Structure formats: structure tokens, C-alpha cells
């Protein structure tokens, strides 16, 4: 109360790790909502770099947590890139593994969805989408095929829920995808991230 409080979830991307600044998308949301009100802004930012959504799902379950997400005036999460990227460079490109990740994170998604909103009525969720950075390499045609595939499935299940909105991300990254990546070629650089914070910036409206 006298306070905007930003409850900020899930992987390396919201960690803001790649920027090369200490701003992730985050901090680039935080500026832009202090353009619109003189309001003190609270980041609470609980991302851990390897979460994966089953993992988020049981950080979720912690009394700590849940309080905190109980006090949000808005959500901002990213998830599922861990559950899609585990390792061995996509070496799980074996349909079968692939389909059985996708279900678990779909599975998992609804839940985290549902816990949410149980604990927070009203706070808007922003859920940001996957990006390809893997689209200048020998296989972007299944790669962009495959993460335009898990969007898809994300934005159906944030669909059921009330105000919960699918930031895309994709086309972000669509073009030069190299001029807005870190060295690793994974996580996103000082422009990826601003570009992401400017979208999600975008979509907040305080009056």
C-alpha cells in the first residue's frame, strides 16, 4: 500500500544472467514505470538460473514464497527454456523424449497458473514465451518449428486463467539473432534484454 511490488519468477532469463549491465528485462520495466507514477517500485525477484518448471511448481509450495506472491500488484515470469534446452546441446531431439518433456511442461505450466491464482487474485501475469537462438545454425528450420510449438501450447494454457498474458518473444530475436545474444550463444545481451523489458514495459498501464 504506497507501494507498486513486482514479483518477479522462474529462469535465467528474469535472473537477468548474459547482460553484461546488471539490468535484466527487469530493470528495463522498472524505469518504464517510473516514467508513469512516483509511486516507490519493489522488485522481488525470486529466479533461479536452472529452474525448470517442476522446479518452480515446488518453490511455489513454500510458505515464503507464497506470501510474497500473495502481496504482488503484477507478476512477470519466464519459464520452460530449461525444460526445453535440459542439455546435451538439444541432444534429447528424439521425438519421443521431446513429447514427453512438452506434456510435463504443460502439466506443470496449469498448475503453476492455478497455485498462482489462488494465492493472488488480481495481480496481472505476464508469462514471457521462448525465443530461437539457435535459428542461424545448420537445423533453425526444426528448432524455430519445435519453439513456436511450445508457445503455442504455453499461451492455450495461460488462456484459461484470467489475466494471465503470453508475452512473445520470439520475433525479437527473429533477425541477426547473434546482435542480441551473450557469448554463449543462449541467453540473451545488454539489447536482447532491453528489447524484452521494452515489450513487456509496453503492455503495463497504471492509472
Same mark, same amino acid.
Given at each position: 500500500?504506497?507501494?507498486?511490488?513486482?514479483?518477479?519468477?522462474?529462469?535465467? &532469463?528474469?535472473?537477468?544472467?548474459?547482460? $553484461?549491465?546488471?539490468?535484466?528485462?527487469?530493470? !528495463?520495466?522498472?524505469?518504464?514505470?517510473?516514467?508513469?507514477?512516483?509511486?516507490?517500485?519493489?522488485?522481488?525477484?525470486?529466479?533461479?538460473?536452472?529452474?525448470?518448471?517442476?522446479?518452480?511448481?515446488?518453490? &511455489?509450495?513454500?510458505?515464503?514464497?507464497? #506470501? =510474497?506472491?500473495?502481496?504482488? %500488484?503484477?507478476?512477470?515470469?519466464?519459464?520452460?527454456?530449461? %525444460?526445453?534446452? =535440459?542439455?546435451?546441446?538439444?541432444?534429447?531431439? +528424439? /521425438?519421443?523424449?521431446?513429447? $514427453?518433456?512438452?506434456?510435463?511442461?504443460?502439466?506443470?505450466?496449469?498448475?503453476?497458473?492455478?497455485?498462482?491464482?489462488?494465492? +493472488?487474485? $488480481? *495481480?496481472?501475469?505476464?508469462?514471457?514465451?521462448? !525465443?530461437?537462438?539457435?535459428?542461424? &545454425?545448420?537445423?533453425?528450420?526444426?528448432?524455430?518449428?519445435? /519453439? #513456436?510449438?511450445? +508457445?503455442? *501450447?504455453?499461451?492455450?494454457?495461460?488462456?484459461? !486463467?484470467?489475466?494471465? /498474458? *503470453?508475452?512473445?518473444?520470439?520475433?525479437?530475436?527473429?533477425?541477426?539473432?547473434?546482435?542480441?545474444?551473450?557469448?554463449?550463444?543462449? *541467453?540473451? +545481451?545488454?539489447?536482447?534484454?532491453? #528489447?524484452?523489458? $521494452?515489450?513487456?514495459?509496453?503492455?503495463?498501464?497504471?492509472?
Amino acid at each position: 500500500d504506497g507501494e507498486i511490488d513486482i514479483v518477479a519468477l522462474g529462469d535465467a &532469463l528474469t535472473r537477468g544472467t548474459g547482460d $553484461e549491465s546488471g539490468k535484466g528485462y527487469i530493470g !528495463y520495466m522498472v524505469d518504464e514505470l517510473r516514467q508513469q507514477t512516483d509511486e516507490p517500485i519493489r522488485v522481488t525477484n525470486l529466479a533461479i538460473r536452472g529452474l525448470r518448471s517442476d522446479g518452480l511448481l515446488r518453490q &511455489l509450495g513454500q510458505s515464503e514464497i507464497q #506470501r =510474497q506472491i500473495a502481496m504482488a %500488484d503484477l507478476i512477470v515470469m519466464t519459464i520452460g527454456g530449461n %525444460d526445453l534446452f =535440459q542439455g546435451g546441446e538439444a541432444l534429447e531431439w +528424439n /521425438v519421443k523424449e521431446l513429447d $514427453e518433456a512438452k506434456r510435463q511442461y504443460i502439466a506443470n505450466l496449469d498448475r503453476i497458473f492455478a497455485l498462482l491464482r489462488r494465492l +493472488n487474485s $488480481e *495481480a496481472v501475469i505476464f508469462a514471457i514465451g521462448l !525465443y530461437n537462438p539457435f535459428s542461424d &545454425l545448420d537445423d533453425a528450420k526444426r528448432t524455430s518449428a519445435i /519453439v #513456436r510449438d511450445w +508457445n503455442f *501450447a504455453s499461451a492455450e494454457v495461460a488462456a484459461h !486463467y484470467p489475466n494471465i /498474458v *503470453a508475452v512473445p518473444t520470439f520475433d525479437l530475436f527473429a533477425l541477426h539473432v547473434n546482435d542480441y545474444l551473450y557469448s554463449d550463444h543462449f *541467453a540473451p +545481451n545488454k539489447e536482447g534484454y532491453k #528489447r524484452i523489458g $521494452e515489450r513487456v514495459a509496453s503492455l503495463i498501464t497504471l492509472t
